[PDB]
């Protein structure tokens, strides 16, 4: 698809068998999801944004669908205000910016 | 252009007679620039993102040239860690996400 930016670029994702809404975010290095359960071990990460920093849990090699496109990769979990799909998975689904 | 997402989508902008580097951010509603002078009246605003909120000055009807493409809109000025071009100006230069 071609997604214009007059509204927030929100899509449906599937993670853990559940559907969630997330923001396609070219300004994010990483994918950050609100608190949920994911399998396996996690590692710590401190991430930054416009208002300072938050601590998140890094899970690797997580199966995730983004607007129907299949990806397997790193997902951060923590107190993000919104679910964000960052460049680590935008690249897996072949996303580009065009103008 | 077509911009891939293997790295941060950083571009050169011209604003207020100055050249700056800024991040094309589809996950931002607003355009937020580090401290600089801009013409006209302003009013205070709070904006939020991953780590909470920061206080900015809102300037309206500001012209920017983004990677060679002119646009006008509201520009917020304040203690952002990265200059960000948000959707309010991304729309105006015809930027879309494609996959």
């Amino acid at each position: 698809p071609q997604i214009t930016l007059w509204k927030r670029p929100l899509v449906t994702i599937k993670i853990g068998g559940q559907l969630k809404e997330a923001l396609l975010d070219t300004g994010a290095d990483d994918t950050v999801i609100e608190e949920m359960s994911l399998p396996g071990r996690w590692k710590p990460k401190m991430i930054g944004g416009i208002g300072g920093f938050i601590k998140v849990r890094q899970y690797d090699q997580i199966i995730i669908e983004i607007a129907g496109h299949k990806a397997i990769g790193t997902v951060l979990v923590g107190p993000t205000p919104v679910n964000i799909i960052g460049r680590n998975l935008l690249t897996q689904i072949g996303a580009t910016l065009n103008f | 252009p077509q911009i891939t997402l293997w790295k941060r989508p950083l571009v050169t902008i011209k604003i207020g007679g100055q050249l700056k580097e800024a991040l094309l951010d589809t996950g931002a509603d607003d355009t937020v620039i580090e401290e600089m002078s801009l013409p006209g009246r302003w009013k205070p605003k709070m904006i939020g993102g991953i780590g909470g909120f920061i206080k900015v000055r809102q300037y309206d009807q500001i012209i920017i040239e983004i990677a060679g493409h002119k646009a006008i809109g509201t520009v917020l000025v304040g203690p952002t860690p990265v200059n960000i071009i948000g959707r309010n100006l991304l729309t105006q230069i015809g930027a879309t996400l494609n996959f």
């Binding site: 991430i47 930054g48 | 993102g49």
Partner: peptide, 10 residues
């Protein structure tokens, strides 16, 4: 009001 999701790795 949060709407600017800049996100940066450590």
């Amino acid at each position: 009001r949060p709407g600017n999701x800049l996100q940066s790795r450590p």
